[PDB]
Point group: C2
Chain length 457, copies 2
């Protein structure tokens, strides 16, 4: 099965029996993609175990794949390990079902519903600040993914179930506990590599009701949600919107829970990780930090509370965000399974092949980015923003299966930063990893957690 | 493979292909054993999946199995699911290795080392009491396995690593968290039944570094212990004793950790569960409660602090304990794998057969116990204690592979009760499950958690 790309005349690294090329993940996904990109060019193929994966780097062709042919051919992602009842979550479902879920859930993530979510996201901004100042006045360097996680948690809990925790001060609350155990899967830990040399074990683990979503976290939320559904009904958040939806093809009950669980993860270690990266940059780039706090004071004088509207009135802030997402696209890769034999942009691609877009690699490709390793937000200036190909820069994917939560994430994030730079400036500690090396793991997160210094303006 | 016992002319329930008799676990292990015991008599066999299990109820024969032939034939328990590096813990190791571990670890559990452990076990008695009185003065019915667990935790943490937590007030402490996730395996949950219809999947999960001991709890303790070992060395608890041992065949480092992890579980949900049962009895039997608080006041006047010595001076207290253990032997069953063809007490038993002693069933067998469903501690009076066959009553097993921690458990437990009945009396609430129905699950724990009323003497 390792002859495939040789036949198609597509170049790539020589696979080992059974292993395919996975030994080459010893420096993380990202480093492997850049290296293939340099060595082979615009297209290459390789083998996660026996599985052909075809990498592509042409924007037309990438558009063809994420847009033009999404429904017909490229509808789904690759399977990755036993998910149990979580089979039914939107990010994991296939074909007509996913097509369906997207619809049931899409209204929920509208700008308009989002704007109603703003003042709740506001209140925990106050918590974040107050918690920070306690560490600021005790001049002790601060690990971010803690205080940001604690914030990221409060937001989720509240924005999706109305649960109102100071999680940084109550990691004791059974709710907060469960919710944390939902962490970014280390796709390069002992498990998933084995899942990829031995995917024939996925059904094995399914019938064994083994689940990558801790059977306890899920058995908790499942019945947790079942209590909420029956206390609201009858006596603004995601659950409401989703409960409203199934009040008609309409969403189910177990289905509803598994969606919640997705939303819960997503907004947690992603929102948390990204902010960490941003403060790392804001910290190792004092001028950018300052220009930012200048925007926030001119659009919002006197430490004025942000509204929905004033947030989007802030362009530089957006630039910084975008630029950070370029440097750290926490997905690293987009993928779609080729469900039929197809020709796209004059290239034959056979069924079962997994088509991959190496986002990380593209973001640091010299050919589109001057000095791509540098952190330069002016890349995304209203002037320069026009020159950036949407199929090269894809922090949130693209097409019918892009990040459904994109607007909410950006709003969520921006809301925190604004309230954080209104009060504090962030400075590198002797202990701050400079330069920030990347987790050679299967996560896009830093090698070492970001520690900085926090001062009260 | 389902013909075995029919050939040997040994009676038992008819197995279904693949399933064996496991459909008959729908009412828990215990109920199935009593039923086989009544229906077939002194011996019977059945099939957990394709695995022959031979049950026996003859004391001679049970002695033969747990004692006389332990080394030669019956050295090990049955495998149960993927344990990863935990392969090396004493309760799980096989043959010469276990034989070895027992020796390295046996001194640790001496009465004499135990006596030095007493005053530490004392101090958290004070915590237990103070926490209780807070709920006592707020006349709100109390779930036991919480406050007892919280106690059971404090003891372990301290008695094995010197870690000194008020865990009831700090379930936030990363240590306490990890430690809790080590809970009594529900052998009748979705997993282990599948493990028993599909044991050929155990090696499957091994190579997948999948572990029944949460890979995170273990990766925590592993490095947690590695920090302690290197802070003590160089600058009274189980770790010390074990560290001392490997200071010579001597214990290893990973080995040392996996032992700790065992000790940690054992003293947790076992100590916790047992006390829960005892207060349930003490509660549904006011007179027994009173006689007890009378012993504790005569051997220890003026709420006198218990010493090692005064504890064993208390006989009734011991009786109550024993009697409770009769009613609720939390192991339910003892097992040993027959590693060779052998004849014992005039019975042929083939290799690979799993020999089982149905402790629960024996404890409620009428033929040894008058009114066995009743709770009557006078059964264990210094007068009557002589009539109890040690091979019928086996709460802690027997022979070279009995409960290594037996003395410590009994001491641990007794120390708590004494300090608890010195201050409080325990009364049934309208909500108290009366009579206490048993978890039809694979655990010996109650159907419903015990809730009682707590009053300040
Ligand atoms: C900065 C934060 C986030 C980033 C960078 C991000 C990025 C992504 C990416 C790269 C994808 C793959 C899309 C594709 O294949 O084209 C995706 C999918 C998805 N995202 Fe996010 N995301 C973020 C936050 C969130 C949040 C807060 C939610 C809340 C629900 C969310 C929900 C989803 C869902 C449900 C999918 C799968 C959508 C589908 O298959 O229909 N994401 N995201
Ligand atoms: C009331 C509490 C406890 C009860 C009822 C209990 C009961 C048992 C039983 C029934 C066995 C099986 C023995 C056999 O097959 O003959 C056992 C084994 C064992 N117990 Fe416990 N136990 C208790 C507490 C503890 C504690 C606190 C420890 C602390 C380390 C401990 C450590 C062990 C170990 C290490 C084994 C396996 C011994 C070996 O295979 O060599 N137990 N226990
Ligand atoms: C392969 C996935 N995830 C899906 C299929 S598994 C469910 C998924 N997370 C899981 C893992 C953590 C607990 C929930 C999701 O959907 N989480 C919401 C989310 C995450 C990140 C960004 N936005 C939303 C397909 C996919 C792959 C990459 C990026 C996005 C989706 O991702 C990881 C590499 C595992 C992090
Ligand atoms: C089958 C076992 N356990 C051993 C083999 S797995 C390791 C074992 N617990 C594990 C499970 C919870 C986290 C540690 C042990 O050794 N825990 C110490 C202990 C427990 C209870 C009483 N004393 C000591 C063999 C065995 C079976 C029954 C009773 C005792 C030992 O037990 C259970 C039915 C699973 C509860």
């Amino acid at each position: 099965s390792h002859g495939l790309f040789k036949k198609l005349g597509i170049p790539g690294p020589t696979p080992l029996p059974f292993l395919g090329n996975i030994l080459s993940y010893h420096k993380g996904f990202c480093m492997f993609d850049m290296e293939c990109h340099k060595k082979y060019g615009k297209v290459w193929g390789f083998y996660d175990g026996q599985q052909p994966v075809l990498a592509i780097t042409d924007p037309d062709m990438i558009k063809t794949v994420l847009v033009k042919e999404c429904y017909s051919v490229f509808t789904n992602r690759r399977p990755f390990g036993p998910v149990g009842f979580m089979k039914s979550a939107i990010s994991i479902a296939e074909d007509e079902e996913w097509k369906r879920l997207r619809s049931l859930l899409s209204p929920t993530f509208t700008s308009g519903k989002l704007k109603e979510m703003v003042p709740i996201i506001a209140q925990y901004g106050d918590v974040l600040v107050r918690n920070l100042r306690r560490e600021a006045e005790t001049g002790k360097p601060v690990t971010l993914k803690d205080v940001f996680g604690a914030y990221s948690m409060d937001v989720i809990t509240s924005t999706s179930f109305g649960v109102n925790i100071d999680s940084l001060n109550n990691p004791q609350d059974p709710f907060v506990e469960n919710t944390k155990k939902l962490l970014r899967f280390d796709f390069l830990d002992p498990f998933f590599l084995s899942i990829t040399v031995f995917p024939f074990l996925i059904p094995i683990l399914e019938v064994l009701n083994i689940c990558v979503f801790p059977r306890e976290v899920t058995n908790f939320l499942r019945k947790s949600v079942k209590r909420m559904k029956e206390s609201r009904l009858e006596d603004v958040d995601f659950l409401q919107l989703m409960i409203d939806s199934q009040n008609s093809k309409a969403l189910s009950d177990l289905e509803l829970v598994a969606q919640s669980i997705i939303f819960i993860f997503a907004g947690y270690e992603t929102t948390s990780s990204v902010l960490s990266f941003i403060m790392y940059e804001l910290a190792t780039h004092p001028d950018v930090q300052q220009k930012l706090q200048e925007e926030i004071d001119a659009v919002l004088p006197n430490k004025a509370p942000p509204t929905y509207d004033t947030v989007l009135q802030m362009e530089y802030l957006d630039m910084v965000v975008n630029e950070t997402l370029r440097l750290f696209p926490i997905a690293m890769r987009l993928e779609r399974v080729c469900k039929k034999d197809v020709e796209i942009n004059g290239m034959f691609i056979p069924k079962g092949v997994v088509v991959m877009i190496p986002s990380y690699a593209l973001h640091r490709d010299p050919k589109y980015w001057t000095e791509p390793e540098k952190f330069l937000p002016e890349r995304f200036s209203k002037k320069n923003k026009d020159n950036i190909d949407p199929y090269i820069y894809t922090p949130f994917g693209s097409g019918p299966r892009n990040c459904i939560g994109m607007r909410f994430a950006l709003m969520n994030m921006k809301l925190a930063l604004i309230r954080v730079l209104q009060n504090f400036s962030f400075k590198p500690c002797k202990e701050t990893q400079i330069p920030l090396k990347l987790s050679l793991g299967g996560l896009l997160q830093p090698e070492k957690p970001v520690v900085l210094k926090v001062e009260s303006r």
